[PDB]
Ligand binder design. Sequence first.
Ligand SMILES: Cc1cc2nc3c(=O)[nH]c(=O)nc-3n(C[C@H](O)[C@H](O)[C@H](O)COP(=O)(O)OP(=O)(O)OC[C@H]3O[C@@H](n4cnc5c(N)ncnc54)[C@H](O)[C@@H]3O)c2cc1C
Ligand SMILES: Nc1nc2c(c(=O)[nH]1)N[C@H]1C(S)=C(S)[C@@H](COP(=O)(O)O)O[C@H]1N2
Ligand SMILES: O=C(O)c1ccccc1O
Ligand code: MOM
Ligand code: MOM
Ligand code: FES
Ligand code: FES
Ligand SMILES: [Ca+2]
Ligand SMILES: [Ca+2]
Lengths: 49, 99, 1307, 49
Amino acid sequence: HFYLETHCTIAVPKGEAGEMELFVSTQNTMKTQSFVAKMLGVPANRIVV
Amino acid sequence: EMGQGLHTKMVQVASRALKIPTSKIYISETSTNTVPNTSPTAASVSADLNGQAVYAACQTILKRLEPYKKKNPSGSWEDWVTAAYMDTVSLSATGFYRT
Amino acid sequence: ADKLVFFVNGRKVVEKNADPETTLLAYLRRKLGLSGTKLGCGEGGCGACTVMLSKYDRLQNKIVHFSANACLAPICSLHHVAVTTVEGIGSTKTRLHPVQERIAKSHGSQCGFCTPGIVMSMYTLLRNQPEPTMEEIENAFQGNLCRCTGYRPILQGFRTFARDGSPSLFKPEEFTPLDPTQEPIFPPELLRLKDTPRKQLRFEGERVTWIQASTLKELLDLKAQHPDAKLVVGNTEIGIEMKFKNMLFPMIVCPAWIPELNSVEHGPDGISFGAACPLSIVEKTLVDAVAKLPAQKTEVFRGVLEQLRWFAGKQVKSVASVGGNIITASPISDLNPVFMASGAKLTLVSRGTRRTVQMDHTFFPGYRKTLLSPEEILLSIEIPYSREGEYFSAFKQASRREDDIAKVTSGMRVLFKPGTTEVQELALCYGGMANRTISALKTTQRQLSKLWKEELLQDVCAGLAEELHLPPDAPGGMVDFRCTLTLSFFFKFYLTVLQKLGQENLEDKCGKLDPTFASATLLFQKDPPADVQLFQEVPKGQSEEDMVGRPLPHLAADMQASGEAVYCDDIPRYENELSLRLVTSTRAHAKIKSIDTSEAKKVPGFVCFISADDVPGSNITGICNDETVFAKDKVTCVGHIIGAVVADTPEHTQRAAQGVKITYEELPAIITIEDAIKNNSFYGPELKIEKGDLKKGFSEADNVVSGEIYIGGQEHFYLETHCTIAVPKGEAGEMELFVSTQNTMKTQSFVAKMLGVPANRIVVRVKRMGGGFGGKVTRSTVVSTAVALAAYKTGRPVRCMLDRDEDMLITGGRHPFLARYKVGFMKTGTVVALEVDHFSNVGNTQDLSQSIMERALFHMDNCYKIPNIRGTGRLCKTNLPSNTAFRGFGGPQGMLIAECWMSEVAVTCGMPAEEVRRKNLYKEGDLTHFNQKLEGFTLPRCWEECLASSQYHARKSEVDKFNKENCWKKRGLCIIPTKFGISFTVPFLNQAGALLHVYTDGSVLLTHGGTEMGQGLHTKMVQVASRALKIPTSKIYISETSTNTVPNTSPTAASVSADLNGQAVYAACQTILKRLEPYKKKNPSGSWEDWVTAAYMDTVSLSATGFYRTPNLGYSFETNSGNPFHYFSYGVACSEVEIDCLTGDHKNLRTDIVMDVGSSLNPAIDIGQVEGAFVQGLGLFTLEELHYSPEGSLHTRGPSTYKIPAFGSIPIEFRVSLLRDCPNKKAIYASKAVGEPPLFLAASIFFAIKDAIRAARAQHTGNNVKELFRLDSPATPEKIRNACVDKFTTLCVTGVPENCKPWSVRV
Amino acid sequence: CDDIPRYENELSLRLVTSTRAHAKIKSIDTSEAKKVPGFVCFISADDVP
Ligand SMILES: Cc1cc2nc3c(=O)[nH]c(=O)nc-3n(C[C@H](O)[C@H](O)[C@H](O)COP(=O)(O)OP(=O)(O)OC[C@H]3O[C@@H](n4cnc5c(N)ncnc54)[C@H](O)[C@@H]3O)c2cc1C
Ligand SMILES: Nc1nc2c(c(=O)[nH]1)N[C@H]1C(S)=C(S)[C@@H](COP(=O)(O)O)O[C@H]1N2
Ligand SMILES: O=C(O)c1ccccc1O
Ligand code: MOM
Ligand code: MOM
Ligand code: FES
Ligand code: FES
Ligand SMILES: [Ca+2]
Ligand SMILES: [Ca+2]
């Protein structure tokens, strides 16, 4: 692809109920949210991308 | 937005739907907590699909402003907006579209 | 020297360049990232920063544990100490500790800002006393404050730790058991460092050099070479000086490690205490001594113990040294008056020199001075044993009993010649009656050889009033009250000695002791608490997953107790974030002639100073486009924001602000409500509601009474002050702000207007507030715009969290009220006509003034029907900081006024107050004075239900009986009803929005316009959403309130937020259900996840907004028609009090509340709201008071001088019950609002007090059962004592010339 | 994404990838990484919650 901006992700934990905010250079916010939620084992409502 | 100017188009689309300058409309970011279960921005249909959802949301708004536009046709968009708020009318709406 | 090493939660910390000015609280939050420990005052009076300190005592050879205020602890004094923060004992990430679990599950945590601190105080207690008594548990929270809970739940929950051991709000049987062997180990590393000998250490900060002396020689040689060098032990005095009195001691020396200064010797004349000995040790040593020795040898010891009983709190007493209290020489020291009267022996040492002196009046030369030479240091003090025929008493009286500054404090001693009753020695020493600790020499000397009888009492009182009399302009004020106390104290001493002589069988050579006088000698004591909560059970067949009506605890309670809950300032700073501090006016009204930055520019980390000239948009802001963002050309109140200073650290902004020189040209200023009335200075016209015919009314009236009353203001004192973090995005003017605010919408538009950018560019995020109570409905924008401008100016993120002193000064609070009334009534009690003119001091901007005065006018009737009524109000424009909304929004003022004249109507009719009130009550279907219909009038049930609950009549006899048996203590019993209109007076604010998303995994993310400030709103909203969607609350989450998820929201106020948003949330749920219908039908036996997945894949929107607006609202003062409210809240409370006719102190014995909250959404939350509201009302009417100088400058700027309700201020027996079977068709799920309504019910304590004062007056001054004396609010100990006119106050009453400039004047 | 300022406590991450096309992971040693200045930790599959 050679997009001038390579892949990047900033994960910021909130400390409460497993809440986590992620700044991601992605075209798929939805799958990012769920894949991170499945990995952490928390409901999707705790993860905002 | 990844450089294809998707937002520009959406702002244009919305600007035409509400009949207000693009200068009054702003798009900041894409977020899973404002619009959920979104499909990936791919298959070249992001403007087709979203432009349609943005359109729908706009129609919902126009619909609610109608009453105030009729009581003051010579009025501006700002006049109708504050009249609507002053008269406890929701000024927020979602929009959805599926092929 | 050099390296500072200590521990934090087991982890070792190595600070190579420790700054002597760095506090522990500053190091923890800003260096270690432990946000659990909060900043509530930096004054040592709130305990929100409480932590536990553990160290190896090289003296006793043991590991010791104690609590301390991290805001006063210099890390430089923590070398080789182990710190334990809230996050150090447990957390939801692992396992919560019993302390955390119980306070959480017991509903003892609302906003949660004070939880960590409470938890740490309870936790520390349990560490030293594994099975404490209830008394010990409450005693551990003397230095802890909570503004939300009302305390009861906290104590009720912890009662389970005590060895003193309708459904319920919680299940104590379910608390996990406490295993004290599972507590964190004392760092083994510290134990190994105990063998390396101690050596002097030197730390060098930006401006202070700190020297940790290891030996007495080092201390002495240092002080002899650098007499200026400041000694510091507990730092609870010097820490205040540096931070608040802006002092700087370039060289500090800490002697705490020196063993000679920590020794405790038991000698033949008494017990000497090393000068560095913390007050906790003096106390510990003395209590053990008083238990072991003869009572006759411990009279003085008991006096010192009585004082320490009311000396600060545990945190301060654990670090504050006895020598520290002495040398400070504060005129209000509670110990010096005692050490002086008993002539404690002080050993003073200098390098080479050594002397001893027994403290007397000469030991205190002048203000804050002592007899020590510059090279001398106090080595130790000897507290004397008592001799035969020698007695000692100690006294103290302030505004509040716990952790407070004494108004008058004293130590009285007397020596009788052997076997006789003739005075050989007499010493009456006082604090708070002059320049410093003094002795009533002239008066005592004259009593020598006199027999202890009536003649001596009369002569002593007369002498003290003359010899200690204070001038009308004396600093601090309240001269009369203060003098009265010096005589009143002696009277108690006098009486006490008669009893003690009676023990010697000399009760014949001394004055007679009247049986009714006896109770006057008793030391404060209180029965065990009796707290019961009654509420309704949910329908027998209600789904177990339906939480509506169930006592589900506050959703964030666990994380609030574990310190994990994140508040604004707890959010990590960006690597490039800056700190901001506001520069404010020091003039009530004047022209700004110039502003000099010269000195600010010289502070390290200084970035810039912004002002009105930096605003790119509009400098006009405020709800009424009344004020400036930054003052321009003029300042209109002491506190008027002129500009801001930007720097890298809070410490640096402090110094920078101090460096902005400002010269003014003063202009005439209007301060008092009287100044306004006199200068015709108001905001808008007079407001008025009139109904009936006054002229005809007063003419048919048998009697007519005229009167006046003043209701003081109030500071919100939310444990978390104002705070705003603004992060500029650098694109198109976008800015993101994290704000502690009840009003996201006005914050967004106020910042937008200021920056001159569209609202769509500004997003305001609120996760939670450490309290709001109305104080953050508008005044919060004041800090937001300033921080916003700094971020816009620097392009960097910036934050600012006001210190308590800035907050109290700048943000203002509840509106002070002055009212004049005229009530016309018959001899049967029926009131026929009523005229009331209200006046409110609003300040330098109109803010919400008008709306507040209207609600006041809407409740000038309370629950009484008056056919002919006229009420008017005026908004007084004054040069004070602008007041604003405070829980009640005007209602509490208007209603207290009504109960005022109503209490008089009864007294005048010679009829029982409950009867007079009962008969003047509205009935189902009546119209109010503003013509609204009272439907669902449940007040009558509450009244009858409360009378039975409290057994009002049966106890009315108990009260008379106690008053007949006691002369210097009286009791009062009073029952008060209330009616509160629910909904915003501004109709269009009665609207709300919600945004609901359902993800493909089934989990739901919900948001609405309401902000969480501890009222459990999110908890309720999740509950509502759960029920509507028919899914478990565990599948629904609410993260935050944001202007970009739900726009145009009303502030979270007026108590309707649960009504409005719960309705919008409901609307959103229905939209989702209606869309899921098709799939539910095709698969009935399917699960929620099944339907969501199906709906998603059939391309159906799983996101919906919800909206709601209350219908048919709108009042018109013109035609006096239309409904202002959607429905009313009802409640009744009965309260019994006991006052000390000699000090002004009082106990809240019992309070019974019956509240109508309709079908409660959450009875755990509502009872906590009732309790919390009532306790704030308790503070509004009896403890809280703000003093302003004659020139409009606020004197009260912190918990030290502003005393809000403490744990011990709540009613011993506290009974709260929710009215059963009373569904409210007018609100979500038949519930009712409850936030504000309860607060006024505290008025029952106000009138019970007046009832007692009535009793006291009727006895100590002939009589006059029809007498109508005035008692203003708050009814503080000064007002209560002065009201109790007796032979003592008669001698205490100062004149007040014309030219007199008093310390403070009533606003 | 990466232009977004770092928080004062923000850390950097870097993936550790396979140098073989197909093989069994016999073992993983972190002795050297632990010696690197500012090293916080190494996470692997054993860490996913
Ligand atoms: C929340 C709060 C509540 C308080 N309540 C009360 C109260 O109820 N009653 C009351 O009386 N006080 C009260 N205080 C005042 C204070 O706690 C006492 O004066 C305390 O004992 C001060 O001791 P310290 O060790 O913290 O002194 P520091 O602040 O460390 O020192 C105070 C002063 O004493 C000097 N000093 C200390 N030791 C020696 C020595 N050996 N020789 C010569 N000089 C010495 C210092 O150089 C300095 O001038 C309160 C303070 C706070 C912050
Ligand atoms: N613990 C706590 N309780 C509180 C507050 C608060 O800030 N903290 N604000 C009060 C005020 S002034 C109001 S109007 C309501 C606001 O909440 P509500 O509108 O959701 O009922 O809660 C009351 N109870
Ligand atoms: O009526 C209220 O309680 C109220 C509260 C905040 C702002 C405007 C208002 O009318
Ligand atoms: O490859 Mo482009 O459809 O995302
Ligand atoms: O209406 Mo409460 O915000 O004081
Ligand atoms: S912040 Fe330390 S006592 Fe309040
Ligand atoms: S819960 Fe204690 S101050 Fe808010
Ligand atoms: Ca604000
Ligand atoms: Ca305030």
